[PDB]
Design a protein around this ligand. Structure first.
Ligand SMILES: *[C@@H]1O[C@H](CO)[C@@H](O[C@@H]2O[C@H](CO)[C@@H](O)[C@H](O)[C@H]2NC(C)=O)[C@H](O)[C@H]1NC(C)=O
Lengths: 50, 50
């Protein structure tokens, strides 16, 4: 083999061509950002939420 | 007026029914079909999405 897959059919494991060490492919941090606010009629402080 | 003449009998019947449904909950895995149905439908929707 050279590369593996999963049920989702995505590249998650791969073998290096230069050497014989098996690696993994995992995406790094991602996702939508959320906000917390009490409205502009009371204050203006906001809290960012990841 | 009929509760206090067979209180021990109805208590024993209640305990027996509780034990019976305790056995029947783990008797078969098909008694919860709605829950694994919606879980399987969500998992299959995600699987065909990817
Ligand atoms: C490609 O070249 C590299 C050169 O480093 C080879 O890596 C060496 O492989 C030998 C095989 O036993 C090891 O003893 C060495 O320690 C390795 N080098 C290093 C720096 O770790 C690699 O095997 C070669 N690949 C092919 C397919 O020929």
């Amino acid at each position: 083999q050279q590369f593996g897959r999963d049920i989702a059919d995505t590249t998650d494991a791969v073998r290096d061509p230069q050497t014989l060490e098996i690696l993994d492919i995992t995406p790094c941090s991602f996702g939508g950002v959320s906000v917390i606010t009490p409205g502009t009629n009371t204050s203006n402080q906001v809290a960012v939420l990841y | 007026n009929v509760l206090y003449e067979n209180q021990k009998l109805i208590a024993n019947q209640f305990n027996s029914a509780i034990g019976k449904i305790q056995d029947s909950l783990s008797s078969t895995p098909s008694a919860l079909g709605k829950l694994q149905d919606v879980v399987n439908h969500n998992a299959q929707a995600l699987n065909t999405l990817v």
